[PDB]
């Protein structure tokens, strides 16, 4: 099959904010990886190091939400984008507040595809995450993430 990255979700990751609220960083247990959704672009964002053939790769997250962030009804956005090179990204992946639940664990899927390419290339990092959008409260848990490459191992 396809190479498949399992994403370590002890080490490596960071708070991340995008829009006009600052983040309050992240929080490491057993469970995974935790943060605070203080507002609109408030997210957890690792990096996959350079270089990269990301063009038509699969990213799947297990998430858990908090009950106040789905009454919230924020949604959420798993996302990537070239590090340094901040604006050129996919930004086509949404899960809306009505498909979410607290109640439950859930799989978030993005597909990765830009029609220049930008994402199969050797100069930058690509930083790679999930934020909330709209007015959030509450938080959210990622347990893991897998990104499967359109590519054979
Ligand atoms: O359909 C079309 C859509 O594709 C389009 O979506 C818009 C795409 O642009 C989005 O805005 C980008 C959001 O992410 C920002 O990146 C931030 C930048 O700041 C970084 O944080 C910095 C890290 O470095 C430190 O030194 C510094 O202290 C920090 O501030 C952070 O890590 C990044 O995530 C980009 O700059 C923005 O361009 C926008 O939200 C989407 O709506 O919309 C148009 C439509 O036609
Ligand atoms: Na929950």
């Not at 309050?24 to 943060?35: E, H, L, P, R």
Request: glycine residues 10%; hydrophobic residues 40%; negative net charge.
């Amino acid at each position: 099959g396809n190479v498949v990255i399992e994403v370590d979700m002890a080490n490596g990751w960071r708070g991340n904010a995008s829009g006009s609220t600052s983040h309050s960083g992240i929080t490491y247990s057993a469970d995974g990886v935790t943060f605070a959704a203080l507002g609109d672009g408030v997210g957890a964002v690792f990096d996959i190091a350079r270089p990269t053939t990301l063009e038509d790769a699969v990213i799947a997250m297990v998430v858990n939400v908090s009950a106040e962030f789905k009454a919230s009804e924020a949604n959420l956005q798993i996302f990537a984008q070239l590090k340094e090179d901040w604006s050129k990204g996919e930004w086509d992946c949404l899960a809306g507040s009505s498909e979410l639940t607290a109640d439950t664990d859930l799989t978030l899927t993005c597909t990765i595809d830009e029609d220049d390419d930008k994402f199969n290339q050797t100069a930058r990092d690509v930083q790679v995450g999930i934020q909330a959008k709209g007015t959030p409260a509450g938080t959210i848990t990622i347990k893991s993430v897998t990104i499967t490459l359109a590519q054979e191992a």
